[PDB]
């Protein structure tokens, strides 16, 4: 409120003149995803200025962006999916980016939440063969049979703990066998939850088996050559 | 509002008021005017303060034309804010929410009245009548038993009130101690606050609260600054060094362990004398 | 008035279009029906208590013509209006002027002091009569 009956306070005793010109001093910078994705060219970010190339570099390295797999791969089935990345390297208005984390959308989680079934969650803590420390959150629901005459579909805690152990084994094995980009490629066509489904096929009929969330916890040392490799040199223009 | 339904208890009020014919009597909330005309018949002068224009209008219309309208005067406005004269007796029946600040005002009035009579809740009256060794003792109870001495008269009924309230009432009498004992009211109030943060913990722990330690640290510190002395360097907190000081005061007095609902005014004064003695001042 | 605790017959669009568009039509129709009933019952009592013949009272959109005129049908409304009822005199709009019922108008400054006195006397006695 800035009305004439808005009672004055200390506040705007001394203010300034809007002369900063932020959208002229700023500079657009196109970020770009690793080669594991279809539409790597997604999203441009604004660097505050250009006199500090150091400031540009540290800001773009501190950038943590997020996107969805739907807009990432053109298949809008994965609208509920969402990942976070971070620009790790820059090159002349083009910025190398790398994966950071994953989650779903809250409305998807809410819709998957129902009243006559049990939700199981597995929260494993692992480090890749790429030495990326990671924490994985996965979820599934106790569906009912086609012959089910019962209103509910509830199972024993013995089944719960057994299936939990089975899941966590699957995650630990697959991640420790995998690397970072390998984990992303596994993560894309939902094949891991299908594997867990076929594993847990004998214990109980389940549904909505999904890895909920990915948490980067530690990242190893820097390798710009590896980043350039996983993304996919430059001369000048003779200014005189 | 509420209207009385007992001229008999009005007669009891004036009978216990025990009128001197040389009295100027101040009345807050004179009401429909029964007490007003009784005191107008009994005393020399009656000043009535009112905050209700409609009640003051019906009162002046009821009392216009009597011989004692020359002795009756009606002042308007918030009596807690406006100036008040001298009076010998004060009788009133106000809502008690403004009566308790009126209680503090009539205690701290210069040249206080000789006797006064008031109407309170039953709970409020018993809280005022709270003695040591009793459950209703509070800071207000200790204040009123310090500055004055009280006497129960009677109790009132809500079914005898119109309209009947929820909380019961009673009628009490206040007599200010003449002469007033020279207690610094600031010091007495500060110590009463500190001792009655919890009435059933130890007074040791009541000081062991952090904020009282900080307050008395600052108080003793500016006291030492005004007396122009320097304190020995504390390795931890100044709160802790003056806390050790007050602990020495407590183990000197042998009373800080006690329960705050039982200690009397004599232990109160010996403790405050120990504190003024060691240089601790609550203001 | 009093509210109703049954389900509303109309939706939000219906009440809002109703508001987006006689004390009440219900009181109007009630007055109408009891009027026709009173007409018929007065008619029945006139039948039962009449020595002389009384027929039925009456029988109980589109452009419609009113046969019976309560006026000669060729007189202007301004003609039937009385001149008094289309202008009377009142007190003047400027307080420095005083307009009387006989139509005389006086400025408070072109007067003499004795006249102001007797005029104040007249206004005082008339207001005291009031």
């Amino acid at each position: 409120a800035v009305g004439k009956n808005k009672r004055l306070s200390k506040g705007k005793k001394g203010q300034k003149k809007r002369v900063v010109d932020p959208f002229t001093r700023k500079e657009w910078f196109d970020i770009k995803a690793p080669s594991t994705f279809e539409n790597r060219n997604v999203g441009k970010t604004l660097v505050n200025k250009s006199t500090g190339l150091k400031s540009a570099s540290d800001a773009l390295k501190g950038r943590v962006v997020e996107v969805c797999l739907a807009d990432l791969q053109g298949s809008e089935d994965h609208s509920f999916r969402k990942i976070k990345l971070r620009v790790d390297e820059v090159q002349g208005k083009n910025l190398l980016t790398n994966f950071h984390g994953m989650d779903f959308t809250t409305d998807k989680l809410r819709s998957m939440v129902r009243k006559w079934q049990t939700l199981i969650e597995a929260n494993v803590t692992v480090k890749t063969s790429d030495d990326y420390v990671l924490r994985i959150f996965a979820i599934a629901f106790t569906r009912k049979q086609a012959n089910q005459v019962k209103r509910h579909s509830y199972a024993q805690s013995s089944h719960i703990r057994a299936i939990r152990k089975v899941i966590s084994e699957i995650l630990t094995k697959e991640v420790q066998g995998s690397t970072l980009a390998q984990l992303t490629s596994k993560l894309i066509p939902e094949v891991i939850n299908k594997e867990i489904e076929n594993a847990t096929k004998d214990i109980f009929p389940l549904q909505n088996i999904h890895v909920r969330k990915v948490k980067l916890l530690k990242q190893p040392k820097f390798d710009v050559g590896a980043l350039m490799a996983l993304h996919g040199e430059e001369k000048g223009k003779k200014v005189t | 509002q509420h209207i009385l339904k007992n001229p008999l208890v009005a007669q009891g009020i004036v009978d216990k008021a025990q009128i001197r014919p040389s009295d100027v009597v101040l009345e807050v909330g004179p009401g429909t005017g029964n007490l007003t005309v009784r005191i107008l018949e009994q005393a020399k002068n009656v000043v009535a303060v009112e905050m209700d224009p409609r009640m003051a209008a019906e009162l002046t219309k009821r009392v216009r034309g009597t011989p004692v309208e020359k002795k009756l005067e009606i002042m308007l406005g918030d009596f807690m804010k406006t100036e008040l004269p001298y009076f010998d007796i004060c009788i009133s029946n106000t809502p008690y929410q403004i009566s308790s600040p009126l209680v503090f005002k009539l205690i701290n009035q210069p040249r206080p009245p000789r006797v006064s009579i008031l109407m309170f809740q039953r709970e409020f009256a018993l809280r005022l009548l709270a003695r040591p060794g009793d459950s209703l003792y509070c800071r207000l109870s200790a204040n009123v038993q310090m500055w004055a001495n009280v006497t129960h008269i009677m109790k009132v009924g809500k079914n005898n009130f119109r309209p009947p309230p929820q909380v019961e009432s009673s009628v009490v009498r206040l007599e200010i101690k003449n002469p007033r004992p020279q207690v610094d009211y600031n010091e007495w109030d500060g110590l009463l606050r500190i001792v009655f943060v919890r009435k059933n913990r130890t007074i040791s722990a009541g000081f062991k609260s952090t904020t009282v330690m900080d307050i008395l640290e600052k108080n003793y510190k500016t006291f030492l600054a005004m007396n122009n002395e320097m304190v020995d360097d504390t390795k931890g907190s100044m709160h802790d060094v003056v806390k050790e000081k007050i602990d020495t005061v407590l183990k000197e007095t042998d009373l800080g362990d006690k329960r705050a609902g039982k200690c009397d005014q004599n232990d109160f004064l010996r403790l405050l004398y120990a504190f003024h003695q060691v240089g601790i001042h609550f203001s | 008035f009093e509210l109703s605790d049954v389900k509303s017959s109309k939706s939000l669009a219906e009440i809002y279009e109703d508001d987006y568009t006689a004390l009440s039509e219900e009181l109007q129709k009630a007055h109408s029906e009891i009027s026709e009933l009173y007409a018929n019952l007065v008619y029945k009592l006139d039948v039962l208590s009449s020595v002389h013949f009384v027929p039925k009272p009456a029988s109980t959109e589109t452009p419609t013509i009113s046969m019976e005129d309560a006026q000669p049908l060729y007189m202007s409304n301004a003609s039937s209006l009385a001149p008094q009822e289309i202008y009377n005199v009142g007190k003047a709009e400027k307080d420095g002027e005083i307009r009387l019922k006989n139509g005389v108008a006086m400025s408070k400054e072109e007067l003499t002091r004795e006249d102001k006195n007797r005029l104040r006397r007249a206004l005082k006695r008339k207001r005291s009569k009031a």
Binding site: A1, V2, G3, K4, K6, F23, K26, I31, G43, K44, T45, L46, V47, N48, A59, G62, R63, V64, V65, E66, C68, D71, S79, R86, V87, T105, T106, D107 | - | -
Partner: protein, 127 residues
């Protein structure tokens, strides 16, 4: 082709924050307030405030040159309500009528799994 923005819309109970940021939420493009929009203290939670705010931030967004935008509403969250407001719906309608190319709408409200005690009490918080 198009360039996208981040339309974070806080739908407070007595306020409306319409803040747009760039990629990674770092380059803060614009930020506005309901009361600042309509200089009243009752109307800091006004749908009209939401309308004028959305129009103005759409003007700034077309000024900087961002055409398409993903919009993320956020309620109060916390131990308070986590449902966004009619001011939020009004702002959404007003920006859709402003015509910036809406890519995707989100409701990212901070929901406690297991929180602490609210400021209400044993009988209730309000009224």
């Amino acid at each position: 082709s198009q360039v996208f923005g981040v339309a974070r819309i806080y739908a407070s109970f007595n306020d409306t924050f319409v803040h747009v940021t760039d990629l990674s939420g770092k380059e803060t493009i614009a930020r506005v307030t309901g009361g600042m929009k309509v200089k009243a203290d009752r109307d800091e939670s006004s749908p009209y405030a939401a309308m004028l705010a959305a129009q103005d931030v759409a003007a700034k967004c077309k000024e900087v040159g961002i055409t398409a935008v993903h919009v993320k509403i956020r309620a109060t969250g916390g131990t308070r309500t986590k449902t966004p407001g009619p001011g939020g719906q009004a702002a959404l309608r007003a920006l859709a009528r402003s015509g910036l190319r809406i890519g995707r709408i989100e409701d990212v409200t901070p929901v406690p799994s297991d929180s602490t005690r609210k400021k209400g009490g044993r009988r209730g918080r309000r009224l």
